[PDB]
Amino acid sequence: LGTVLNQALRTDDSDLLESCLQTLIIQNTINRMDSSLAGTLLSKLAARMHRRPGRAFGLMRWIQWTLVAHGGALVTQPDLINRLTELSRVLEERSRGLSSLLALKGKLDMLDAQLKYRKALKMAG
Amino acid sequence: LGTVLNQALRTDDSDLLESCLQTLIIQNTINRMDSSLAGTLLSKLAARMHRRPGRAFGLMRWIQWTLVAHGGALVTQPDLINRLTELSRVLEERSRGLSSLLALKGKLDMLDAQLKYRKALKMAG
Amino acid sequence: LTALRHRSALREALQGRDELSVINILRWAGKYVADPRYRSICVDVAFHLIDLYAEHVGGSAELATQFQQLLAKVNREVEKAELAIVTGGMVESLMMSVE
Amino acid sequence: IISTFDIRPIIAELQDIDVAVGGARGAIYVYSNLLAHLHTLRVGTIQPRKYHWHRRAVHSVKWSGDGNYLISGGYETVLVLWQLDTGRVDFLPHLSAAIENIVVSPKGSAYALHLDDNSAMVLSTAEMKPSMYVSGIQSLVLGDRPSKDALVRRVWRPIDEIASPLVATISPQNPSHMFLCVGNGQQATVGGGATSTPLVQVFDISSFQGVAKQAIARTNPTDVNITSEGVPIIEPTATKLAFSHDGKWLASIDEWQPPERDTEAYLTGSKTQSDACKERREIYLKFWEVGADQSLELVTRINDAHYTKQTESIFDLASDPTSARFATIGNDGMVRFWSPKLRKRDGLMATRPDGQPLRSWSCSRVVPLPVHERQPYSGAITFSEDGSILFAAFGPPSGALVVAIDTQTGTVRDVVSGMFKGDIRAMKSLSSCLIMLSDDLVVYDIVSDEMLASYTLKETSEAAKKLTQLAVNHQSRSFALAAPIPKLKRGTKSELLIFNIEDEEPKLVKTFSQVIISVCAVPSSSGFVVVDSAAQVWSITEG
Amino acid sequence: MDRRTAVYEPMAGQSGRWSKVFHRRYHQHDVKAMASFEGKGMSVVVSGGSDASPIVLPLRALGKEFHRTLPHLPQHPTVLSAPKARYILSWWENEIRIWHLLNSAQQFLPLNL
Amino acid sequence: MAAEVVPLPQLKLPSGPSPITAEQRYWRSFKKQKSHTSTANWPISHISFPA
Amino acid sequence: SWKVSKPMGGRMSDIDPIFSQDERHLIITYNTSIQVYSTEDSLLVRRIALPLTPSATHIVSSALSKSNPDYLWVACSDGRIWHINWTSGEGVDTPSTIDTKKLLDMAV
Amino acid sequence: SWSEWQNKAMQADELLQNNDIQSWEELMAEVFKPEWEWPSSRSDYARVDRRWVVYAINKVFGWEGQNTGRLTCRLPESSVLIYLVDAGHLSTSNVKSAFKDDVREVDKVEELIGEQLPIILAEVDPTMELLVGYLSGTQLGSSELVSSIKLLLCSLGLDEHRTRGLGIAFSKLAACPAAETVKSLRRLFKPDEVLVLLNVLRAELIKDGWTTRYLDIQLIADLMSRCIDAVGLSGWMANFFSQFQAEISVALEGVMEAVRLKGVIAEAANYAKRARRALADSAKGKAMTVHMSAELPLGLKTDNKISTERVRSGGEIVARSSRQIGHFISKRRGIYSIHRISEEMLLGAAGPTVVQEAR
RNA sequence: GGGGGGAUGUCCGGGUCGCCCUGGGCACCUCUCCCGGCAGCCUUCGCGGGCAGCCGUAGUCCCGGUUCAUACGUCGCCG
């Protein structure tokens, strides 16, 4: 899908981006993609990130592999730290609730347990 | 192994505890165990916890299932919050480094990537 | 080490190291990151190591393993840090039912 | 730059001189044959010998005795004896602070050392046990001569500054004895910018002499004063410290952190250096048993006396006047009640070799505190005079509130709010009234549930705000305050005010020639005793 | 051998008590030999060490005049080249070494150097 | 009062709620072991000593 | 009703704490306080206060008298000089003004 | 001034027994500094005295002594009351000082106060904008808070002030501590009401959208946790809870990976910034080492420019030399490079163009 | 850093088409004043104040490309 991404990014497509981002080969495409288009990709993926906070599971692995392959491509064209600037601003957003998000987690993994347990009483009774 | 645990706990064995704790059936044993012995079990497992911080993967699942089954058994004999007291003191210990442990994690998952990548250059080159 | 942090010198103590030395210090720090009695100092000196010797890892792969193996243990240390506080809530939260 | 010098004559006449200069660069030049170099348009070459030991400023170089030896005293706490006939240098290395001034006796037999932390010891030469000792109040001083080492723009620049009240107390069961926190010396303490007072001396009020000394935090007197970058090393400093009701226990608490100029590589995202040292602070609570020979012995350190996801900076501590009970409030929101029990694991009693049991204190009770936040707090605490009830000003900015809690039970008796215009500074109890200072100053009775006294203070700078403090007498029901009168410098005047409880009038108005640093209360008698930065103390008494 | 040089003048007055006016760390490696010379308006001492750098010191102007490091390199330049062949070369004891550059500069006007 | 050179003492790290007490150290300190076997593996009825 | 004690204690100045003749007495200069100790017991025998009262004036220099011993000259930031005699307190109330711009140093 | 205020209090008692509420209310307006125009400012109110506040609230509210009395509105339609709302004096300590006499025998006083008051405000204002104002302004305890959010559940379980009040009460109860919250909830709530607010808070999380996908927190954390424990075991005598903790797990793992990538990108960003700096000075000609290729060098080190100052022994500072600077420049030169000199440099105008090998 | 200018090189509408300009992109040298630190001198006990100030960046006759570190008192065996 490498040329697909190249085309879609440089033409600034929307739905082509959606088609290739619905889905290894991912890594191969990020090996074979370009640099400047990858930074623009970074920009609109932080955009999708900011727009709907639903799934992280593919797209973080994506930008992982961007910084894998063409990480130093932003070192090569380092005027776009203003692209890199907002990602800091973007990824500091999703750290927000974590400052006490676990304080939820335990009392909820508490009521998990007896509800598993009184359930684990239930077929026994 | 339920009677095994019962015997070993009330006799305060060491190596019997080791034998049964090397290893589902775990859950069945914790269903079929007793109460007061389970609290003493809790005490020496927090002890092992404090003594060597190597594996959490079985023993946390163990004490999970203790609080599953005979969680309210400590509600039944609630003079032993002093047993429950140190676990707070024990499990606040292993939370220590987490206040910045991730600050390690990323820069290390950074150098992961290109080392995967320049490796992923390597058979290609 | 805690004295060599008390006096701020841990930088200067670290900077004069070679490859084999770095490996030994690395394997040590990896060996003791687990015990929360001193995880503070372990992670700090590891920070200085990464800050001060991460340049030649492309030259020497053997430390890159230990670098990975450093990462590798820690990868399993956040889980222990979480799995504690997973049960960490549980033990505190029984305590509010007893009354 | 000439830091000092000392002459030596060459002889019913004077035939030549040789004069020695010592410089803050860390050098000691000596000039050898002056009178005939200079008596005779043209003169020959002259060239000092250069003798170089110290890194810091030599405070005082003096010719010795015979004129065979050149002795020297410096910051780095070490008195050098230059051999001057060989090349060698033999030296007395461990002093408690900077060697500030030396003089050589009439015969060569004695040295006098004015140790920079306001003391003096007379040595005999080459026996080096101090045949004589006289110490002073050891406190923090607005010193008149600015410095010796601050001449050449050092990395951390020395500023004669004061940033905290001088932490101190008076001892029940020995009212002649005052405990007060101190550093290696004044100059070494204030150096490094921050306060570094990991030490106590106990000092007599009746006869203003030294009595004794001991350590609290980790101290390395045996060590280099300076990290190799060129900076004085900061050493842990005990914020709060108070005395037990019987006269048997002493609770210190120390905080320390790395320097921001060290951290420098812990910066990850928005991590800044203040953030990082603030993360890596250590806060120890140290429980002490009092030896009636004025000695301190540990019973128990607690490493994290207030914990949340980080160690919580601890606001204050207090002593139950009725019983051996200590009290802590910190950054988490919880107040902890500590009590001495016996180290006894399973019935057997662990004893010191005489058979006496290793008593150990422990957090007896735990209370969370009600918080009421409208849209970085603080804390202050005090028992009643009769005990049984503890009063906790918990301190979010201007919105803050005090809570009164019984001691027998952990239930909240009372809670009062709205009584502070800003950040709370401190709070004490008389027999019915809570006196409290934030930006405002308020006496408020609680059994009447009514504010009695209100005083707005004139606006000053934040350092002055930090340096104001108060104290109550508990024998005559009377309290008092202390405040400088408006960046802090040398000549700064303070006023103190004696206030009785029932009236609004200040019962004694008096300013002082300098800024008064600390007020303390004699438990046995009425009155107060005040410590003033130009290091002198005096008492104040009714009657 | 502690790469140090020290300088001596009599303690004036009583007889033959010499003195160590001062010392300095001059070379980079240690000072294996040095010899004096004084005359025809010139008063120097040459210290040659293991770091191959003869330094001249002003004998009578010491503490008063800057020392001078000579080059450790031979005055004859010991490097030659065939510009037509673009062959650079030099020599010492018995080995004569030759490199080729194969390329211009403007071609490169990084990864290929 | 030339304060003496002392090496930096080691720490007293915080101890968890199960240290081997002095007594358990004692009964571990009954150190050396020897297993004398009986005749023909008879089980051992009774041992004792005078006073 | 309440009363203030006289200021006591003091910080040792940075001036030479002079020996006596016969080495038995050490004479030290605190700010606003000159006091003499006997060497053997390390003990005070005299505390001679010196009233300073002009924001920051300080004891500048002081020494034994080289013509006659048991005499102390002392001089402050402003030029006020006392010629007291130890073992005694004679001369506190009788300074002498030197009329300087600013008195920086002195020796006898 | 005590006598003066006591006489003023006597005059207001006279205004009360004359039932001259308008003139009395004007006196209150003068004290607080009918028209009664407002400053559009919760914070910018002038400071008043506790004696006038306490007399005001004593005048406004009522008590019932039967071993357990009851606050009541003696004047339910009062701009002085709504000023007490917007000025946030409505505290338990205030009303305690108000009724120190009759309540000195009563116990559990904060609890009865916090369970009585916001209900009384609610029946005063069914549009409850006064309620959200009281919530937003007054320092609040958890009892008051649970009773208020209960009132909000009655209101719901023209349509924005209520949601605003939900969020504000949520933030405040988040600020509250655990034990007091939990015991208050267990006192004043019923498990079904708790199920309703569970659905509320679930809806809030999924409406923030932590699962509903990309191309397709801490506050509520402390809340939801504390409430379900505050119910606890005796109440629940399933699939709802399992799908609940399913999406909860999805949420927390999204958080976890979010932490991972926040880390890696903050690294990359700071490196990029120092790299931009470095390429700026390299284009300037300060002849450091910058990286060329499209790949990250492992050691993210941007070789800084030399500070013009130096730290000698012992701790002093002076100026670097030009000379020692040139020494360090010689150090920073690599093994091989090209150093093109231009005619303008030969003229003394421009600077050089250098290309070093990739070290 | 900002605010600004004068000048360098550049594309896209372009313009009678040339001097370049406006609209977008700009990176630089130069000038400007407010940022941070430094030093002197007069002032005043001090606090402060005034004065004309440099530097915030690069490569030298040589050359600061330096100077610089904490005592003895007593060793060993085993408990």
Side-chain angles (χ1 to χ4, degrees), chain G residues 54-57 101-102:
Chain G
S55 50
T57 40
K101 164 165 295 187
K102 181 172 175 249

Side-chain angles (χ1 to χ4, degrees), chain H residues 215-245:
Chain H
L215 183 41
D216 200 324
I217 306 96
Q218 70 285 2
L219 279 64
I220 186 161
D222 204 1
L223 313 179
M224 180 61 155
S225 40
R226 283 163 180 195
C227 74
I228 315 170
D229 197 355
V231 183
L233 286 172
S234 273
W236 274 285
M237 302 335 296
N239 289 337
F240 150 65
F241 284 96
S242 49
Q243 79 213 351
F244 173 52
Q245 284 176 347

